[PDB]
Design a protein around this ligand. Structure first.
Ligand SMILES: [Zn+2]
Lengths: 63, 286, 135, 45, 37, 127
RNA sequence: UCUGGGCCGCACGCGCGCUACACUGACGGAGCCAGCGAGUCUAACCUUGGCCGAGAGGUCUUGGUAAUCUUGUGAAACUCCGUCGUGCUGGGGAUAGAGCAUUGUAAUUAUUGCUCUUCAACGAGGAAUUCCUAGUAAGCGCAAGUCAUCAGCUUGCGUUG
């Protein structure tokens, strides 16, 4: 079941604009720990860009 | 407060004098010494003075002398006592007292009869004390109108208990071996009682009575048997009732239905499968 | 860190030591479901065996389950010392043990009937309370 | 009659007749006061 | 105890003084405790 | 058993070796000291033990302290313990070790609440 | 005088409070800021520092009879970085058992502290009701009295506000 949710994260990230862990779990798809692992893998990838980082909230921008 | 052990210190002449005080205090504002001496119709000044001193040291009659005007003043406990004597003349109260539940305007004790059956009581202390006449008169009339409400609710086949008497503002009720849902935990046949508890709202509103404070603390559930678990639902919402002709009954009715569905979805986790009883069908039902 | 996802090979509801566990929460808090094992004891049991606890319990293999089960009955050999255990210096045999989910109730019933046949105040107080609030 | 009276003849002006259903059951360990025998065989209906 | 009036109630035990409060409230000025604020 | 130890060897060692097999409360109680009157208590205890008929119960030793740790030289003895008012004749069995004597001696009859007939009848008279 | 029990025993009502029902949060690391105080003799108080122990704490010494030492009371709430995702959950911590320590002559009706386990009700509370107009409400800890040991008791202090 891994490849289709790979496609869901790699499709959902270039659609909407502002990303946090709460916004990832408001896609009714993913858990919050896996939302952070997708956030850190996406920061290593480079589709999103950082704006502000904090341990509770972290907003991003689609690029 | 009320300490009921002290009225058996009194003789026959003492509550005869107390009956003279309550007879003379309902014609004028303050009754003096010679109206108690004359209205009582008893022989001596000495016995009147001894009975008045007996009520004074038991804090039942307050001595007041406001510049050459001797007079006496009834407190709460003396009129509680004489109401319980005229309840004793109606040969039913015999032995009184365990405080279970202290309300704002009505305090609940635990009484018995000559037969020894378990009963309770409802006193009415309006203002608790700057005693006049309006407080105790309003307590008396409130007790009277809730006695007619109580008899009318018991006479129409409801699960509302039996009244006996309305002796001034002292109201004597039957004890019910019942538990609230604070104590109650789980029941076998929850949809049958939910059917009974919407049917209670239906025939109250068909009678035209709207009980408003219909929280979890209202319902008292009697356990008649321990092997078959027979049940009875006792509802105490007597001063908060409103008539069907009032203008604000709509949010009262949906508040009652909303509270019973939220309390039965919270504790017992039971959901209503039929729809909620709405106001207009019950309005045409009365 | 890095996302690693696998096509299948995770189980929703598992069962270990005749007790049911669920494979979507982490290993420690799937092991809080069984009785007699809490959080800290399960942390110590799993962190002895070099188990990564950041990952979840759905990708637990059988060789991890067998070594956890092998930790359970004799923790004293593998540097899990005396003060972490529930059975400590018992009156029956004088050794130390960690009681399991079908053995906590045998321990509790053994303590209560032992207090009964001792006829201590604790025992007669507890059985009088049970026989009175039960009735 | 005065034989079957738990209290004195004051019931016209005093108490209620108090019922004392004495459920006496004997537990036998060898040598026991009334307190422990009262703690052993309490039955609530 | 309070060595003024045989007081077995209302003691203050600070500084090894053991006076009751109802005797301290009139002997405070002779000791040195004066009402300032 | 006490520590996995068979009982007949446990009957014949001294108090210090019981302390070496004791829990922490018993060792802390031993570590400060006793008064002299339990020596007379154990003297009259073994005096009543030595006059016992064979295969029967020994003479009762009426005890009164409720704070003493059980030390098993009185295995087989029967004692009557004061509660403050009366005596409870309790025999010592070897499975009650590590315990105070006062937990065999209750202090009150229990609080009864499931009796509505006796409660209703005894209210204060209102006349 | 001597012992032994209590005043805490529990269907319960009333009242003053504590902790919570959570993600402005629970947990793990790091940043770290106070003031009102108080402290021992013909005794043993406040305790610095070093060893042991998971800890509770023990032990060996030293300072202060005090703006000097505890103490700069490096307090907590807080700040950041990671774990948890709305699931009576990892919230909550009632109850209960086992062991180890400390005070007390004596701890059972468990004095108190530590370790593991048990993880109970309780999804912002009805009728009604308490207090309050600026460093003030509220949250938060600390000090002093009760002190032999613990506070949820009281009075003050300080932090954020
Ligand atoms: Zn004095």
């Amino acid at each position: 079941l891994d490849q289709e949710k790979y496609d869901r994260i790699l499709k959902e990230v270039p659609t909407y604009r502002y990303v946090s862990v709460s916004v990832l779990v408001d896609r009714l798809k993913i858990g919050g720990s896996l939302a952070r692992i997708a956030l850190r893998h996406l920061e290593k990838e480079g589709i999103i860009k950082p704006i502000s980082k904090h341990s509770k909230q972290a907003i991003y921008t689609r690029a | 407060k009320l300490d009921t052990s002290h009225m058996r210190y009194l003789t026959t002449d003492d509550f005869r004098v107390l009956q003279a005080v309550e007879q003379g205090s309902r014609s004028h504002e303050v009754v003096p010494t010679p109206l108690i001496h004359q209205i009582s119709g008893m022989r001596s000044q000495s016995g009147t003075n001894r009975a008045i001193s007996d009520l004074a040291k038991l804090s039942l009659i307050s001595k007041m002398r406001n510049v050459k005007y001797d007079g006496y003043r009834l407190t709460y406990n003396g009129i509680d006592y004489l109401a319980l004597k005229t309840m004793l003349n109606r040969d039913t109260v015999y032995s009184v007292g365990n405080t279970i539940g202290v309300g704002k305007e009505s305090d609940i004790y635990k009484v018995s009869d000559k037969n020894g059956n378990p009963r309770v009581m409802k006193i009415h202390r309006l203002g608790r004390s700057n005693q006049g006449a309006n407080w105790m008169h309003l307590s008396r009339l409130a007790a009277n109108k809730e006695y007619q409400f109580m008899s009318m609710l018991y006479s129409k086949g409801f699960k509302v208990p039996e009244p006996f008497d309305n002796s001034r503002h002292i109201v004597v009720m039957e004890l019910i071996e019942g538990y609230p849902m604070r104590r109650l935990r789980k029941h076998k046949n929850i949809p049958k009682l939910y059917s009974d508890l919407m049917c209670f709202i239906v025939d109250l509103a068909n009678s035209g009575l709207i009980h408003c404070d219909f929280n979890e603390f209202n319902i008292m559930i009697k356990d008649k048997l321990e092997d078959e678990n027979d049940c009875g639902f006792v509802v105490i919402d007597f001063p908060q009732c409103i008539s069907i002709q009032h203008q604000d009954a709509d949010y009262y009715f949906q508040r009652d239905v909303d509270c019973i569905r939220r309390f039965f979805k919270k504790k017992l986790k039971y959901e209503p499968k039929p729809d909620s009883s709405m106001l207009d069908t019950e309005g045409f039902g009365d | 860190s890095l996302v690693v996802q696998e096509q299948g090979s995770f189980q929703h509801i598992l069962r270990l030591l005749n007790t049911n566990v669920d494979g979507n929460i982490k290993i420690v808090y799937a092991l809080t479901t069984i009785k007699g094992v809490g959080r800290r004891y399960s942390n110590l049991v799993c962190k002895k065996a070099d188990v990564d606890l950041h990952k979840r319990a759905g990708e637990l293999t059988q060789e991890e389950l067998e070594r956890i089960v092998q930790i359970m009955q004799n923790p004293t050999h593998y540097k899990i010392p005396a003060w972490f255990l529930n059975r400590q210096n018992d009156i029956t045999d004088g050794k130390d043990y960690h009681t399991l989910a079908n053995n906590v109730e045998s321990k509790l019933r053994d303590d209560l009937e032992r207090l009964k046949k001792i006829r201590a105040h604790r025992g007669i107080r507890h059985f009088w309370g049970l026989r009175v609030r039960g009735q | 009659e005065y034989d079957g009276l738990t209290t004195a003849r004051y019931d016209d002006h005093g108490f209620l007749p108090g019922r004392e259903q004495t459920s006496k059951k004997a537990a036998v360990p060898k040598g026991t006061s009334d307190y422990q025998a009262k703690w052993y065989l309490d039955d609530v209906i | 105890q309070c060595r003024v009036c045989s007081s077995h109630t209302g003691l203050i035990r600070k500084y090894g003084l053991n006076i009751c409060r109802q005797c301290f409230r009139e002997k405070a000025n002779d000791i040195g405790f004066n009402k300032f604020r | 058993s006490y520590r996995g130890v068979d009982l007949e060897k446990l009957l014949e060692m001294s108090t210090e070796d019981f302390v070496k097999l004791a829990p922490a409360r018993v060792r802390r109680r031993f570590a400060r000291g006793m008064t002299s009157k339990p020596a007379g208590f154990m003297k009259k205890l073994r005096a009543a033990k030595l006059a016992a008929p064979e295969n029967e119960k020994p003479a009762p030793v009426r005890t009164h302290m409720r704070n003493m740790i059980i030390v098993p030289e009185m295995i087989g003895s029967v004692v009557g313990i004061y509660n403050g008012k009366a005596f409870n004749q309790v025999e010592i069995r070897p499975e009650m070790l590590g315990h105070y004597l006062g937990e065999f001696s209750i202090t009150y009859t229990p609080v009864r609440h499931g009796r509505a007939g006796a409660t209703t009848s005894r209210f204060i008279p209102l006349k």
